[PDB]
Amino acid sequence: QISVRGLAGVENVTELKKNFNRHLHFTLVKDRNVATPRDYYFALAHTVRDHLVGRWIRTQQHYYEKDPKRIYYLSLEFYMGRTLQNTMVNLALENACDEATYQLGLDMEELEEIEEDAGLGNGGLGRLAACFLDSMATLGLAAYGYGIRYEFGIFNQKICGGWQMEEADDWLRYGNPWEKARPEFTLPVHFYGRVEHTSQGAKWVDTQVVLAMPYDTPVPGYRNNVVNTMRLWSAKAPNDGYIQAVLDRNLAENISRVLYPNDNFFEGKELRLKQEYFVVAATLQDIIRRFKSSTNFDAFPDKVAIQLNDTHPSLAIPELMRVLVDLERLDWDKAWEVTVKTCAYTNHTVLPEALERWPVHLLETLLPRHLQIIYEINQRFLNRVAAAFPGDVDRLRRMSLVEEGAVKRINMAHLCIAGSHAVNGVARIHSEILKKTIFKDFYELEPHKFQNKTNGITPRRWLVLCNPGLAEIIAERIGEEYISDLDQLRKLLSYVDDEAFIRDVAKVKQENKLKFAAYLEREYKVHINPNSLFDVQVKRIHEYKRQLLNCLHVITLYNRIKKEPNKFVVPRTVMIGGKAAPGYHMAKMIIKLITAIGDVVNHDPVVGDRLRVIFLENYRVSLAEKVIPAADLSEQISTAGTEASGTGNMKFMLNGALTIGTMDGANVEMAEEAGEENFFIFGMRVEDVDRLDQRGYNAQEYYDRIPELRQIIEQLSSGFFSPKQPDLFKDIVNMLMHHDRFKVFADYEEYVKCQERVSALYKNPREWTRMVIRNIATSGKFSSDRTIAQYAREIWGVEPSRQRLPA
Amino acid sequence: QISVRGLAGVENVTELKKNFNRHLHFTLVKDRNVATPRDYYFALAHTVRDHLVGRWIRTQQHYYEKDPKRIYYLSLEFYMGRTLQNTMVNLALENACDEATYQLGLDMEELEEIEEDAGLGNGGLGRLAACFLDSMATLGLAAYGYGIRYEFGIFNQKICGGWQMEEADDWLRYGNPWEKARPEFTLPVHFYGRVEHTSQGAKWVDTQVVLAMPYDTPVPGYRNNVVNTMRLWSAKAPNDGYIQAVLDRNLAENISRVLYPNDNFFEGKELRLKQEYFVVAATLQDIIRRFKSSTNFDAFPDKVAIQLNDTHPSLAIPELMRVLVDLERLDWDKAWEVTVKTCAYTNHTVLPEALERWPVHLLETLLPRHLQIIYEINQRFLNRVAAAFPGDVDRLRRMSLVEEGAVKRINMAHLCIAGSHAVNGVARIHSEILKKTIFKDFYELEPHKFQNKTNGITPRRWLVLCNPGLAEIIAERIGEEYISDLDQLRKLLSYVDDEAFIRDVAKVKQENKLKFAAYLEREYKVHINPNSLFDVQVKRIHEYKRQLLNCLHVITLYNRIKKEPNKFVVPRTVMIGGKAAPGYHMAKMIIKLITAIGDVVNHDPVVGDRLRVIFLENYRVSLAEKVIPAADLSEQISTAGTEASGTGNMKFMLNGALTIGTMDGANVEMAEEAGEENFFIFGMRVEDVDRLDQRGYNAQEYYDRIPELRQIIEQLSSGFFSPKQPDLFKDIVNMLMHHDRFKVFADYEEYVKCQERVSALYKNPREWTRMVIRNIATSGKFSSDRTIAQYAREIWGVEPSRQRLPA
Ligand SMILES: O=c1c2ccccc2[nH]c2ccc(Nc3ccn([C@@H]4O[C@H](CO)[C@@H](O)[C@H](O)[C@H]4O)c(=O)n3)cc12
Ligand SMILES: O=c1c2ccccc2[nH]c2ccc(Nc3ccn([C@@H]4O[C@H](CO)[C@@H](O)[C@H](O)[C@H]4O)c(=O)n3)cc12
Ligand SMILES: *Cc1c(COP(=O)(O)O)cnc(C)c1O
Ligand SMILES: *Cc1c(COP(=O)(O)O)cnc(C)c1O
């Protein structure tokens, strides 16, 4: 149908049809008379999977022969979403499969909707890991993603009476055709026990054993015949009254049962610590085994890079030391040299509630040898600090890995900095904040360690896959090379005054909006005006992300309409979606507020279809792929200094939405790339937030000086949005007035005024679309291919490649 | 190689080789450089599996079109063993696969040894179910086996210091290629709750739901292209703090976690009751669904037969009543008529400790509606008894389904008799005992219900598969038709004086013994004399089976050798194997005694290799297939009246062993078929045991009158077989002397004298072999094809068929 989706060769279509029929018969054990759409989905998945395996075996054989430096990306989350379409895109099979299925009387898009998301992550951190795997494969790096195979991923969100309810995500119920169990490579992981000392050295004895069984999933590069591996560990009990002993195997196996549904927030639970050590211990054995199949660990850092995605896999540092010192019998200083040169750490947030600090008593019980190693690391590190800054005793307590107080804790971020040769933030402003604030002492000791690697997104999933219409009209003008070289989008600046291109860009957006408007009616029985401005904020529900600021604007627009019903206003559909962590009370109340505002606004006859407020249920990767291409306005409105980077922001920019945002995270670099004149920037800068913190933030001042703001707070307090329960939102009002860490009121006036400028521009479709073109054309920097190239050259010491392996 | 293993056609061998290579590459994702024997096993299994699916789909389609009466065999156990070789035998693929694998440089017998037993049973009852499935498919019956997919089957037995240790049987660790998950046919099962009454009728509300997910396994008939289904249910929690709620899903899913390892013994545990209802509830929904796809339940018994394997699935009776009355709104009398005509019950034992009696309070809590239905069944049944036997009040209490006492219980056997149109025992003597003793009252009320169906074994697994050498020399004389018509073995009586046949029979046994003797050294590092008489007792460890009587004989032989070292005695290898239930103390002590006797006997220089005593570890179906073909003497020595049938006895007879046995269970019919002169019969008959019980069994009398018996008891008591722990066997001695329910001493003298006659005959190889031929030749009656033909005609009302379906 469209050129970017590849060729539908006569022979290939014939071969796909017969293999489809083979799988339906032999693999699924069905005939066409009793087959359901789900059976047809699986037949297609197995057919496409077959095209991966030759390349997969060949890739891994190639790495064994050439023995390049291996990159190990350790993460507790890989937010992969669906795999079928992504695989077809990367193998150039999409049109052929479309034709083959069409000839069998099937609609391939219908079959794609049957696949469950692999929701093994919460949000940004987990999705970054997924984008990174795609880019590492596309750039020909010998890269392995290592994590946990959670039996239950992020919960499915239901909205009942306006409230979030959680349901278990039983994503493996119908099977996962993409994974391959590898029980033969199962490895032991140790917990508890005690340390005894001998003439030889320390020994960790009397431990409990849990087995780590790997499942391997292929990760195809973009049309280069490279297929890398994501290896996810599953917990199994070893085989050694009788009935209760067998039933109690669940205790061990619970380690891999469920993803903790926290986003940018730390809770010190023992099961989570077990998960963290589980992935680390199994992974490091696998790394060392692969290295030994190449005595001398001097070459270990030349053959191995370990990238720590946040502090969650930080135990890699003392585990590597444990293995090298206790088992391989290396002296401490040599082991430490190897460890530091091997490990690198990426920080993803400065929010203090998100930093991992584990109680010592927990480590003492669970991992007694690792605690000893951490203490030794700390003593040697602080001796260096003392030599560099003599007499600076406060610095010593500030930099210590051990935090004193009622309960002694280990600061895992401090451990990571000490044991890594490179530490990076994820956007320029964030990396600067790290050096100026929370890691200032460490930067002063070891400035060379500190880097920036601005985040990015894969243009395969986030353009070609989710927005083929846009990818096609771009390809028509500048060819297909931009899909693996996104900087080529700069060529589109030559078409900003091209009347044909302006029309095509606008047409693609309108079609996307019509498609999404239809999807809403089908699945959720809700009607919207497709000519309205689609105003979208999708991301996890958090105070720092300020969904509440969006809510205040929505109520402002509603009140203004009620005040002057017969004045024209630009019609809007305001969509807000995202999950709240189950224990996060305030986040759950914010969801209830949004639906409550919808209940009033959507049923007021005077409003008509000029304003609609919809809460998008169960926001997840598959839904992002639908809503982002349909968006006109991207809401990126975190308090300056709180969103380390953001990546949803980049997805919207690539898909033809304009951005309203604070100068926070990667928004700063996006505005710099596109030009501030082509961005809707408002609000306090980081420096303004600091100044306000110094004199003290008084929300009452804004309430007293802004009548429109006062009206809204009175409406909330009085029960306007909750008639049968007038004090329902008292906690929200109380927070805003007296305990708002994120200064919602301080940015309200500028936000509302900025939103008026958005509406003004939307009234002129041609100039709106020209500004969109300027955004799309300068989105190239935000390819994760660029990000990974920088990690490769500046941290891992390996060169990327776009050369194809032989099929 | 040999004709019974089928043809190795050039095209078939070529096609198997390419499909093998396809599976290794695409299915297993391996190349030949890194493949292990296990990978090669799986490649072969998938290749053979592919040949089943066409026949499997075609068979089930055939049943849908012709709509024959369906037979539902409900069992809590299916002791299937390995599937690969059985499948090859039944599809005539064995030689072709042998050739194909040979050409790829692989030994197929080596690959067969990698497959795990599907050990979803304990012993005789579970293995009977497996044999029955094979025969039902071979006879072209539209038959379905329904059970539970236990995650852990019967434990693996290790012997440590002479003591049994249990290890979990993680049989699904590497995957099960034979099963097909059918998540789309998942069904709900209800527990707990309460009953409320309305104008309409009773309703069972406020229940907890567990999902039953089916897995289907093919069951091929012998070379008739029929492939039936065994459907096993797996327990799943429905999808509706957060973390603990997800972790607590294990509570529901524990229903299908583990097989209770009890053999011929009842324990009233709640989890077991949940297992029993789980299989029943899911199965009956599946039955009714299939029936409705053919309002009118008058025809239900014409289209459905439900066979209850023991009382374990007895809840089918009140569940069927519940569905018909509460959900389908049939009147009670009509529902009862349908239920009785649909259900039939097989009793497998008269031992009182094996009879299922569930406490009322347990049923009241778990299954409150079923308890109500059971009470109503009981009231109506006892009203019939009262009308038939007026004034006989003791009969009323004897026949009641409800047993009074400290704790009220439901007698599930009584429920089964009341709600079934046919009740059968499993051997003639057993069926007679049922009518004369435990079910006498029921026989007097409804004599027409009571039948016999003597057990049998499948000659596919238990001759062709495990003893191809014997199958081949038979086929050479009488052709191959006997494999599905075992009565044709009677033709071998014409060869009892044939010198060539005598030599061949003897040669096959010697080769089997050499092969087994080698297997013992390889796997268990134990040496044996292959020219000795192989004296074998393999079966679960039980007091009623009298492994202890065997032990007494072994010690007698040892003592006689020590008394006259230089006298010639026929050399013996005495092998005893079997598992003990983990809680069965006395059974565990018996195992310890056997190994303790071995420790003394096997290391006494004066004995030499004239007597060896070996405990065969981890007795299971795969080991039975090895040891039975190697046996000379089959020990079937249960106290008369205790072994309902036995089936191991039949396996030995078919494979060229002579039998030493009591007139118990099917031994009676085996001796009748072969002639008593060709059987080593000894000991009390049932009538003798009764007479002894009337005057009272005094073991002291035998001790006082038999000096050789006295010596052994003194040796046991004094610590002869346990020097460092002299009173180790005090419990065994105490039991034998004062509390022996099974009269070990009463049969000792006759047993020893009978064993002397065995030794005498073994000294004359020609006459031994002629007697063997007379046994093999008259084993035809004990084919499970004969058994199933009788169930079909006399209980289910369906005609068997040997006509082949088109491939
Ligand atoms: O501390 C925990 C935790 C503790 C116990 C159990 C489960 C847990 N799960 C977590 C999941 C995530 C996080 N932390 C973060 C930190 C940053 N981010 C986001 O990362 C993106 C990629 O760099 C950025 O674009 C974004 O700005 C940032 O917020 C992000 O998305 N989650 C922290 C935790
Ligand atoms: O009562 C239980 C039970 C209770 C709680 C949990 C698990 C349980 N498992 C059981 C497993 C088996 C049995 N009962 C029997 C009864 C007879 N048999 C044997 O059946 C063979 C086939 O007919 C006969 O050849 C043999 O003579 C007989 O002993 C045989 O092999 N098991 C009873 C139970
Ligand atoms: C990109 C993405 C995120 C991250 O969005 P931010 O706005 O950067 O927080 C979260 N969830 C999903 C499903 C995504 O695709
Ligand atoms: C046949 C068989 C049994 C039953 O043997 P009996 O001697 O009849 O109790 C038990 N276990 C296994 C593994 C069998 O093959």
Q: Which keywords apply here?
A:
807 residues; Rossmann fold; ten-stranded mixed sheet; six-stranded parallel sheet; 47% helix; globular; binds the ligand O=c1c2ccccc2[nH]c2ccc(Nc3ccn([C@@H]4O[C@H](CO)[C@@H](O)[C@H](O)[C@H]4O)c(=O)n3)cc12; nucleotide-binding (chains A, B); glycogen metabolism (chains A, B); phosphoprotein (chains A, B)
Structural account:
The structure is a homodimer of 807-residue chains. Chain A is of the alpha/beta class and 807 residues long. Helices cover 47% and strands 15% of the residues of chain A. Chain A has 33 helices and 25 strands. In chain A, strands 1, 4, 7, 8, 11, 12, 13, 14, 18 and 19 form a 10-stranded mixed beta sheet that branches. In chain A, strands 22-21-20-23-24-25 form a 6-stranded parallel beta sheet, sandwiched between helices. Chain A has a 3-stranded antiparallel beta sheet with strand order 15-17-16. At the A-B interface, α2, β7 and α7 of A face α2, β7 and α7 of B. The complex binds the ligand O=c1c2ccccc2[nH]c2ccc(Nc3ccn([C@@H]4O[C@H](CO)[C@@H](O)[C@H](O)[C@H]4O)c(=O)n3)cc12 (2 copies) and pyridoxal-5'-phosphate (2 copies). The site of one ligand 7LS has 26 residues of chain A, from α6.
